[PDB]
Amino acid sequence: TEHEYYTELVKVKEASWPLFNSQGSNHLSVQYSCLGGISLGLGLIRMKPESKSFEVQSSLLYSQAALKISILNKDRDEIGSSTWSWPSQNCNSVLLKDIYKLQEILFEMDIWNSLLQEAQSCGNQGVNFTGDEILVPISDDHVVRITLETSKQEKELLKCLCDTLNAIAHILFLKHCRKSDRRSQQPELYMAIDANAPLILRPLIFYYNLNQESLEFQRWLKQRDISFKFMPNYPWEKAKDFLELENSLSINRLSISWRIMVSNFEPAIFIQHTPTLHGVWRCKDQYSSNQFSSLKNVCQYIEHHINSLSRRSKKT
Amino acid sequence: MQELYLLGVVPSRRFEAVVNSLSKTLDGPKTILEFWVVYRPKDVPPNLPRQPDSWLRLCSNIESHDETDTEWSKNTQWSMYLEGNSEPKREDKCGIRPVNRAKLTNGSVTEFVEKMGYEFSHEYIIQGLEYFFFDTTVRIYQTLIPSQQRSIKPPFHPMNEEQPWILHVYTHVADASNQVAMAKAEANLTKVKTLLSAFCDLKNVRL
Amino acid sequence: SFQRQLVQRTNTLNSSIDNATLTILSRFQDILDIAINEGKDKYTVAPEVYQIECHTVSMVRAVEQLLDVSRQIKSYWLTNSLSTSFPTVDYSEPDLEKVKRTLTKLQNHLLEVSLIEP
Amino acid sequence: SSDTQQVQNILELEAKIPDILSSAGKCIEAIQLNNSLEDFRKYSKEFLETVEFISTGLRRQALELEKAEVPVVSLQPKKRYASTPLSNLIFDQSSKLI
Amino acid sequence: AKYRVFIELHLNEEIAAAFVLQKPILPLIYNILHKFCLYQRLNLLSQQTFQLSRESWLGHLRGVYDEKPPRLRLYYWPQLGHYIHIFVNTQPISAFERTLSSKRSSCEYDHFLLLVEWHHDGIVEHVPLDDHMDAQHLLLLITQKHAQLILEQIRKELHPNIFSEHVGGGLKIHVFDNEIIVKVNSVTGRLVLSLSPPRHLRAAEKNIALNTQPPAQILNRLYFFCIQTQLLEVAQCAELHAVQGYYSFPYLTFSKGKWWVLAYNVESNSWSVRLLNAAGQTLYTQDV
Amino acid sequence: DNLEENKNQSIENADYSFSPEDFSVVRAFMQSLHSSKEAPDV
């Protein structure tokens, strides 16, 4: 019985894993979350005479889990869909495979802890959760509901959206793991609420309201057909690795110029747009600069020009 | 700012194991390189405190700055420290001393110590690693002698062939009056002390 | 101190070892003292039998004590820190370009981009 | 001799211990079934080395356990946050999703 | 399978015990079958509370289980505390006692229930239970009723000037709404300006966390200030600088440009003119 | 059940973790039941 066991432990230690003794149970146990994430994880290597080969016990709930995300319709019929996945391993033993599924489960439990915990603080952007699910009300009556697993071209496009929503959440999650390093970032704290939020999801909303708003604006111009020049400059336009792209997502202001074209003679009205993540429509015409908030005020502000400038055309 | 220092000799014979250990049980490592300077007061008669700690200590991070440059002596960032003596008969519990992290920004840097009438005194380069632990932090020392005065060109000169690595736990109390914050700090350092006593022997040391 | 801890622990280990071995050898050694037969009273023989069996059980027990030590030492050799973080599937190193084109495209979805300019 | 290797060395020690039983029971058997003092002198002469070599082997392996200077108490792990392989792994899946 | 083993033993003992003493006979098993599944019902709840402690949602949850007959003690967010108890109980009623029976209808069971106390309210309301049920959902319904009582309370503390729907205190400001749903778990109402809110966040929610002043006068400040936020955007055409060199009285004091000084104003809201220095000729109108 | 060396070493906080807890409280089920069956008698 003896030689069978500690040699297996050699098989694991050879693969470089932390090992620690337990209570009176006396079995050695694996720190399976050695790559880490948030919470610590342990698992005794239970002897299994019934199968000879050993198997690791753990307190983990579901044998399988992943951060499912999906798109409700107006009737909340599902349209888009996603589920988190992992690349295949090539273990020399079943037990190590169990260790990997084990660690990935603890990992996903932690990411669920993250979105659930932020879900408290971010509700003032309109985020909701009943606890069993996380409502995210948005445009065109939809909810990007999220749930952990228990136990024509548009579909492909939305599937790509699901890829983004699923992966980027993990990336930002890892960024939060980087932020757990405790540099204590003072200046943003007063731009922050309460307090050390992961910020794992808020920017993801931020770019969405950005998209929907700019879209609505361009549709407002198209409704009466007027020339304009959209001028994007995203933070992630420049990156040489995922480490830079990781920092591309931040609380930083995102200016966007809008050289709308009206008069064929009088100068185009510059329209700065700077939505800060937390903590927006700065007009600038032939007359003087202005600072708004609602896009509708920007619209009527244009209306003063289509009106009064036309009256200027009528002056002579 | 009342710092709560600790000290711990590390023989170089076993130093790498300590690194592999700390990396697996603490935040960081963050790389540490720095160039101390001391500029000496020179006035008579007393009462000048003229204490060995009374001599001023300007500090400057130098790691990110490139070795080739020679005009780093002013262009580099700088800071100023005092570090008063530790409180008397302080044992078991960590020694505690006042510290003041001054900073400054101008093209005129070093010159000011002469403007105070102070002149050049002893200096030494520090290298090692820091490890975060919420508020508390532990830095490990190597006091390399510079290859030339105010020069940043390797090799730098060891004090001896087998220089001990000088481990140094510390934390920075915002103010001495708050025994509450003193309690939280003494607690945190106590937990750190327990955390790494398993492979090192820290102790209070008078200063 | 760090030293005296391992030292005294080593003292404990050596103590248990010498005690176990001395136990086995003593219990066996006294059986020969018990081995005598002739000239004994019939009653006197009786306790000696139980003494034999008990010495044997004591021997096998100290033998168990030895393995009990062996498990300890094995546990000590696996409580040590790893030299390095373990290798995994670093294979198929991910592209940066597609991620950018996808993010930038989706963010610009249904949007009439008009270059940049200074 | 490093890390797991000493443990494997302990495996070498493992086979010897149980036999020490029957060998003793062999020794007595020489005065028992064999009824021979000389053969008992033989196997008793053999039997003691099973004791000596294992005892000294333990004391020496333990001495190695001290020379290795492995700490007496298991360390409390930090909540490790970002080993690189985890990072490029998650990145690998990210491209896998893309 | 251990349950199929260990359970049968003692029950088979008691079935004999019915004959060892007086005849009951069958129902004595029945009762024992409930509290069993009821006591486990507490564990299956109580253990989950610990999952909500060590994991999300972290703190403000520490309902100790008790070794006596079982007794939960859930706690909550600090607020100058608050707690739920849960118990099995026995409440016989005559309404079935005689109207039933004489059939396949039990007299005494007897008896078993599920208390759910809701203290620090004086209500001690016995909220319904109906599986599926979890440690969470109770806390959810409880925060719902409790916090909504805080909502209606502050609604009473609100000015008459600003009417509010029962939906959650979602007060209007022509036309934009300011929903003020209370945060689940920890308080500080997660108000939503309307999508993504401006700086008033820090002026509100974080300021509400400051705890100073009643959560009303501050809201009063918000109603006072947001209207200014509207008008100042409307102040761009015709430089209504709203100079405060006259007075900070609620009626408000817009200026004019580009030029004793006349002072156009709005308050009722209604059209109004009050040139003043002093206080000169004034008159009001009502267009739109 | 029936009834409900120096190897004290283990990781401090442990949690999150696992450690049997091979069995618990199951004895308290039925025993609370029989202590309660005698309750009306009491």
Q: Where do the structural domains in chain C lie, given as residue ranges?
A: 1-117
**Contact between residue C2 and residue B200 where contact means Cβ atoms under 8 Å apart:** yes
CA C113 to chain centre: 65
CB atoms within 10 A of CB A246: 18
Q: How many residues does chain F have?
A: 42
Alpha-carbon span A152 to A157, nearest angstrom? 9
- Looking at the complex, report in whole angstroms how far the Cα of residue D14 sits from the nearest Cα belonging to chain A: 8
Q: Is D72 on the interface with A (CB under 8 A)?
A: no
Contacts C74 to A, Cβ<8 Å: 6
- Identity of the amino acid at D50: T
Query: Chains touching chain C at 3 or more Cβ pairs under 8 angstroms?
Result: A, B, D
Q: From chain B, which residues contact C within 8 Å (Cβ)?
A: 17, 20-21, 24, 197-201
Contacts A41 to F, Cβ<8 Å: 16-17
Q: How many residues does chain B have?
A: 207
Contacts F24 to A, Cβ<8 Å: none
- Looking at the complex, report in whole angstroms how far the Cα of residue D59 sits from the nearest Cα belonging to chain B: 23
Tell me phi and psi for residue A145, to 5 degrees. -70, 150
Reduced to 3 states, what is the DSSP secondary structure of residue B156?
coil
Whether A242 and C109 lie within 8 Å, measured CB to CB: no
Whether D77 and B17 lie within 8 Å, measured CB to CB: no
CA C73 to chain centre: 6
**Contact between residue B131 and residue B138 where contact means Cβ atoms under 8 Å apart:** yes
Q: Which residues pair with A78 in a beta bridge?
A: A72
Measured in angstroms, the resolution is 4.4
Whether D76 and B195 lie within 8 Å, measured CB to CB: yes
Cβ neighbourhood burial of B53 (10 Å; 0-12, 13-18, 19+): middle
The two three-digit tokens of residue A137, written as one number: 């009300």
Alpha-carbon span E103 to B32, nearest angstrom? 87
Contacts of A193 (CB under 8 A, 6+ apart): A121, A124, A278, E201, E202, E205, E206
- C-alpha count within 13 angstroms, C-beta hemisphere, residue B160: 6
CA E163 to chain centre: 20
Reduced to 3 states, what is the DSSP secondary structure of residue A269?
strand
Q: Which of D74, D78, D79, D80 to mutate to test the interface with F (most CBs of F within 10 A)?
A: D74
Q: Which residues pair with B132 in a beta bridge?
A: B137
Reduced to 3 states, what is the DSSP secondary structure of residue E264?
strand
* Method used to determine the 3D structure: cryo-EM
Task: List alpha helices for chain C, DSSP H.
Answer: 2-34, 42-78, 97-107
CA of D77: which chain F residue's CA is closest? F11
Q: Tell me how many degrees the CA angle E109-E112-E117 measures, rounded to the nearest 5.
A: 155
Cα distances (angstroms) measured from residue C112 to each of A85, A215, A222, A299: 35, 9, 11, 19
Whether F16 and A24 lie within 8 Å, measured CB to CB: no
CA neighbor of B136 nearest in space, from B81, B95, B191: B191
Alpha-carbon span E184 to E191, nearest angstrom? 12
Measured torsion, CA atoms of residues B13, B17, B18, B20, in degrees rounded to the nearest 10: 150
Q: Is C44 on the interface with D (CB under 8 A)?
A: no
Tell me phi and psi for residue E128, to 5 degrees. -65, 145
List the end-to-end C-alpha distance of chain E, in Å, as a whole number: 80
Contacts D51 to C, Cβ<8 Å: 21, 24-25
Whether A59 and F16 lie within 8 Å, measured CB to CB: yes
Sign (positive/negative) of CA torsion E249, E250, E251, E252?
Answer: positive
Cα distances (angstroms) measured from residue B8 to each of B2, B4, B15, D67, D93: 20, 14, 12, 21, 44
**Contact between residue E39 and residue E46 where contact means Cβ atoms under 8 Å apart:** no
Sign (positive/negative) of CA torsion C71, C74, C78, C79?
Answer: positive
| Strand bridging mode A289-291 / B143-144 | unpaired
A 161-190 residues with CB < 8 A to B:
181-182
Tell me phi and psi for residue E284, to 5 degrees. -125, 155
Whether A87 and D90 lie within 8 Å, measured CB to CB: no
Alpha-carbon span B186 to E57, nearest angstrom? 29
Of the candidates E2, E32, E54, which has its C-beta nearest F33's C-beta?
Answer: E32
CA neighbor of B23 nearest in space, from C82, E71, A186, E254: C82
CA of D95: which chain C residue's CA is closest? C94
Whether C96 and A239 lie within 8 Å, measured CB to CB: yes
Place of tokens 């004290």: F8
Measured torsion, CA atoms of residues B69, B72, B75, B76, in degrees rounded to the nearest 10: 120
CA neighbor of A76 nearest in space, from A161, A149, A136: A136
Alpha-carbon span D88 to D92, nearest angstrom? 6
The two three-digit tokens of residue E198, written as one number: 């401006």
Please give the order of strands across the beta sheet that includes A67-72: A78-82, A67-72, A144-148
Kindly report whether the peptide bond that precedes residue E258 is cis, defined as omega within 30 degrees of 0.
yes
Contacts of A85 (CB under 8 A, 6+ apart): A66, D93, D96, D97
Q: Which of D76, D78, D79, D80 to mutate to test the interface with F (most CBs of F within 10 A)?
A: D76
The two three-digit tokens of residue A167, written as one number: 């992966």
CA of D73: which chain F residue's CA is closest? F9
Reduced to 3 states, what is the DSSP secondary structure of residue A123?
helix
B1-207 has which CATH code? 2.40.320.10
Please give the order of strands across the beta sheet that includes A19-21: A19-21, A28-30, A43-46, A55-56
- Looking at the complex, report in whole angstroms how far the Cα of residue A22 sits from the nearest Cα belonging to chain F: 5
H or E, element range at B80: strand B78-81
CA of B18: which chain C residue's CA is closest? C81
Alpha-carbon span B38 to B189, nearest angstrom? 29
- Identity of the amino acid at B45: P
The two three-digit tokens of residue A69, written as one number: 């995300």
Of the candidates B20, B24, B199, which has its C-beta nearest C2's C-beta?
Answer: B199
Kindly report whether the peptide bond that precedes residue A21 is cis, defined as omega within 30 degrees of 0.
no
Query: Chains touching chain D at 3 or more Cβ pairs under 8 angstroms?
Result: A, B, C, F
**Contact between residue E49 and residue E63 where contact means Cβ atoms under 8 Å apart:** yes
- Looking at the complex, report in whole angstroms how far the Cα of residue D78 sits from the nearest Cα belonging to chain B: 4
Q: Is F12 on the interface with D (CB under 8 A)?
A: yes
Q: Long-range contacts of range B70-78, CB-CB < 8 Å, 24 or more positions apart?
A: B70/B151, B72/B152, B73/B109, B73/B110, B73/B150, B74/B107, B74/B108, B74/B109, B74/B110, B78/B103, B78/B104, B78/B109
**For helices D16-32 and D4-14, angle between their N-to-C axes, nearest 10 degrees:** 20
The two three-digit tokens of residue E144, written as one number: 């719902």
CA B193 to chain centre: 19
Contacts of E267 (CB under 8 A, 6+ apart): E250, E251, E252
- C-alpha count within 13 angstroms, C-beta hemisphere, residue B104: 18
Taking CB atoms and an 8 Å cut-off, how many pairs form between chains A and D?
72
Contacts F15 to A, Cβ<8 Å: 39-40
Contacts E54 to F, Cβ<8 Å: 15-16
Whether D73 and F9 lie within 8 Å, measured CB to CB: yes
DSSP state, residue A51: T
| Strand bridging mode A257-258 / B125-133 | unpaired
